[PDB]
């Protein structure tokens, strides 16, 4: 049977939430949407409840709601944000107006736990281990995150980590920067290297002041693209630009990451390769010697594959709304 809901004005709208969720107060000051921290009386968990905004206002709004709901419903993994609950106060499709999503309150992100300080090599092994475990899962579902950065990485005080928002500009692969039509999963590996470097050194690896500045910082660490990478460039404008570059040597990473664990440096080398086909994958990185104290080949699960074609249809609002409603009704909460 439907829970008892209660009405309580929050974020200058009337929230209606099941009574199980207690003590709602806003968090993140709108950086996350319309979100409140809550106490879930049923599970004993501190949770974040998100009231979707304007979810069926337009075709693109409707479409995006459906997508956010389907993605979250599909993600079931310790290192990826999933759903504890999804509800609407509506009894019918004709009543259906609002969607609320519930997940774990981790309560900080990566910056909020690091504060520009060098981390110990052991704490860096733990944090990167968890990103790569989570990313192995997302990638097995055939999803590319594309904007993996510290603000997208939720961390509790115990430094247990979940990846959020899955599918600044400082963590972005050069081809994402340059708006290449195609890319592979290892765009996210590039982001993990930037994150890992910054964790070890205390400092942002490529703090470009703008797009071109970033690119010059990247090229200066990893050399100008060699002959083999140039053979893979389609765009004549990009080709012309590259050849017009003054060639330069890849920097030695031992001299950039002075004093680091040599296994960390070895991993950084394998992640931060200009050519995306040549970067280590997440499943491979998880087997690298760097993570020996954490790697467990029997607890690094893969996802059932995910149909992105269902979310990129051109449908009517009412069609996307009735679909989204069926996702709500069909929700079965985790064990
Ligand atoms: C992933 C959850 C929920 N998330 C929104 C969300 C996503 C999916 C979903 F289904 C429900 C809610 C954001 C609030 C971030 N979030 C957090 O735990 C979080 C929480 C915070 C946060 C706060 O919690 C806080 O300031 N207080 C006072 C509790 C401050 N920062 C910088 C935060 C960063 C994150 Cl990532
Ligand atoms: C300054 C110019 C250097 C930018 C080089 C980025 C090269 C990234 O690598 C390229 O990734 C593409 C995916 O986007 C694939 O099409 C290619 O196979 C791969 O070589």
């Amino acid at each position: 049977e439907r829970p008892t809901f209660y009405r309580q004005e929050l974020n200058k709208t009337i929230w209606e939430v099941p009574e199980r969720y207690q003590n709602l107060s806003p968090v993140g000051s709108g950086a996350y949407g319309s979100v409140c921290a809550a106490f879930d009386t049923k599970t004993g968990l501190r949770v974040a409840v998100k009231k979707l905004s304007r979810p069926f206002q337009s075709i693109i709004h409707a479409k995006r709601t459906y997508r956010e709901l389907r993605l979250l419903k599909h993600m079931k993994h310790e290192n990826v944000i999933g759903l504890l609950d999804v509800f609407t106060p509506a009894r019918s499709l004709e009543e259906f107006n609002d969607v609320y999503l519930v997940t774990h309150l981790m309560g900080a992100d990566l910056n909020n736990i690091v504060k520009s300080q060098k981390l110990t090599d052991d704490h860096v092994q733990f944090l990167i281990y968890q990103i790569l475990r989570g990313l192995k899962y997302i990638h097995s579902a055939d999803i590319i995150h594309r904007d993996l950065k510290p603000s997208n990485l939720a961390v509790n005080e115990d430094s247990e980590l979940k990846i959020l928002d899955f599918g600044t500009r400082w963590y972005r692969a050069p081809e994402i920067m340059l708006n290449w039509m195609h890319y592979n999963q290892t765009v996210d590996i590039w982001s993990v290297g930037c994150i890992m470097a910054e964790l070890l050194t205390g400092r942002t690896l490529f703090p470009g002041t703008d797009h071109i500045d970033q690119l010059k910082l990247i090229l200066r660490l990893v050399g100008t693209p060699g002959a083999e990478l140039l053979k893979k460039i389609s765009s004549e404008s990009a080709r012309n630009y590259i050849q017009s570059l003054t060639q330069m040597p890849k920097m030695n990473f031992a001299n950039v990451f002075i004093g680091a664990n040599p296994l960390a440096v070895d991993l950084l080398e394998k992640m931060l390769v200009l050519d995306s086909d040549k970067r280590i994958t997440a499943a491979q990185a998880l087997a690298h010697a760097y993570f020996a104290q954490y790697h467990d080949p029997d607890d690094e699960p893969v996802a059932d594959p995910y149909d992105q074609s269902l979310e990129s249809r051109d449908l009517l609002i009412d069609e996307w709304k009735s679909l989204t409603y069926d996702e709500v009704i069909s929700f079965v909460p985790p064990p």
Side-chain angles (χ1 to χ4, degrees), residues 2-6 8-335:
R2 176 196 149 120
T4 306
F5 281 66
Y6 67 99
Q8 165 177 3
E9 151 153 342
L10 279 139
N11 282 146
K12 292 163 172 163
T13 103
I14 300 282
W15 293 38
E16 207 183 341
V17 300
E19 63 197 9
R20 76 185 270 197
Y21 302 113
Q22 288 295 306
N23 296 310
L24 266 71
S25 88
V27 286
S29 287
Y32 304 108
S34 188
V35 186
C36 293
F39 191 60
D40 180 358
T41 66
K42 161 160 188 183
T43 66
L45 289 166
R46 289 183 267 93
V47 301
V49 188
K50 183 179 188 190
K51 183 174 182 171
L52 288 185
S53 68
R54 342 196 76 119
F56 313 119
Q57 135 143 179
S58 58
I59 273 157
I60 293 308
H61 264 109
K63 190 171 169 163
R64 258 141 52 158
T65 296
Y66 169 86
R67 171 178 177 164
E68 196 187 343
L69 214 210
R70 287 203 97 229
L71 269 184
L72 290 174
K73 277 186 78 176
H74 190 81
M75 302 290 111
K76 306 170 187 196
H77 181 106
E78 308 176 350
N79 312 127
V80 177
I81 289 296
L83 285 171
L84 293 178
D85 195 22
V86 52
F87 58 87
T88 181
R91 312 176 160 280
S92 72
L93 178 69
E94 17 298 314
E95 271 212 308
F96 196 39
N97 306 309
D98 302 295
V99 176
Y100 301 74
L101 314 168
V102 189
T103 199
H104 294 288
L105 197 54
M106 308 298 290
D109 63 25
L110 209 42
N111 312 305
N112 278 52
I113 231 64
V114 305
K115 317 120 151 193
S116 327
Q117 286 297 143
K118 275 196 159 170
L119 258 21
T120 63
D121 188 65
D122 309 64
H123 193 13
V124 177
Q125 289 173 201
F126 189 47
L127 292 169
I128 311 295
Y129 179 69
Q130 289 176 98
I131 301 162
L132 290 165
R133 189 176 175 264
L135 216 34
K136 180 200 170 170
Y137 180 86
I138 294 163
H139 288 174
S140 67
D142 203 17
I143 301 171
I144 304 163
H145 193 292
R146 264 174 297 251
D147 194 31
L148 242 220
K149 58 217 200 168
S151 39
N152 272 155
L153 295 167
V155 193
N156 61 25
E157 242 180 33
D158 283 350
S159 254
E160 294 165 340
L161 171 161
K162 300 172 187 310
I163 298 169
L164 66 137
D165 252 347
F166 29 89
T168 184
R169 90 179 89 258
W170 294 345
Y171 306 90
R172 308 231 260 243
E175 64 269 31
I176 306 288
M177 308 260 71
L178 281 175
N179 214 65
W180 254 228
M181 198 190 152
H182 306 90
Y183 38 69
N184 75 286
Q185 292 171 331
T186 67
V187 301
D188 292 333
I189 299 304
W190 182 276
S191 308
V192 174
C194 295
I195 292 167
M196 180 169 160
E198 164 171 356
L199 294 198
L200 290 156
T201 60
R203 102 202 333 269
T204 312
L205 180 66
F206 303 117
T209 39
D210 66 17
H211 274 257
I212 294 143
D213 192 44
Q214 285 256 338
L215 273 155
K216 283 150 48 189
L217 303 177
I218 293 154
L219 283 189
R220 200 155 152 207
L221 186 76
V222 301
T224 51
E228 149 154 16
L229 178 46
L230 172 74
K231 255 157 131 271
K232 296 188 282 174
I233 317 301
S234 195
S235 153
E236 64 133 72
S237 82
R239 297 216 334 142
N240 306 161
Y241 184 73
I242 281 141
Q243 286 161 77
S244 92
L245 278 166
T246 166
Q247 299 198 256
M248 72 154 289
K250 182 175 90 59
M251 288 201 198
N252 203 271
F253 282 37
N255 278 36
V256 170
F257 304 109
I258 302 140
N261 192 333
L263 306 165
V265 172
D266 180 83
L267 193 58
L268 290 174
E269 300 269 17
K270 274 156 175 43
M271 295 178 166
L272 293 163
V273 188
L274 197 50
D275 191 347
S276 78
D277 299 313
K278 311 227 94 84
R279 303 166 198 169
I280 208 162
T281 68
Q284 290 157 4
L286 280 171
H288 186 283
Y290 195 56
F291 306 108
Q293 64 177 149
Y294 295 119
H295 177 48
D296 183 5
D298 299 306
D299 200 32
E300 288 157 358
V302 293
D304 299 330
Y306 177 80
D307 188 0
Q308 190 231 250
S309 82
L310 289 182
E311 75 207 30
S312 26
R313 294 179 277 177
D314 299 302
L315 310 189
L316 292 177
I317 284 191
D318 288 353
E319 283 171 333
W320 288 120
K321 182 168 174 147
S322 167
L323 286 177
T324 300
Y325 189 74
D326 300 347
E327 301 293 345
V328 169
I329 297 316
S330 65
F331 183 66
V332 166

